[PDB]
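Researcher: Checking consistency across runs. Here is Intraflagellar transport protein 140 homolog again:
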Amino acid sequence: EDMIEAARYYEEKGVQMDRAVMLYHKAGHFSKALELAFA
C-alpha cells in the first residue's frame, strides 16, 4: 500500500517512476503502472 504513495510522489516527479513500477511489482500490483512502464 505504501509503495503506491511512493509511486505517487516519485511519478509526480517522474525520475523513479520506473522504480515506482518496480515497487508496484514488489507491491503485488505490477499491473499498476505496468503500462506506465512505457517500455
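Researcher: Does this match what you'd expect to see?
Model: One thing to look at in this run: The chain is about 55% helix and 0% strand.
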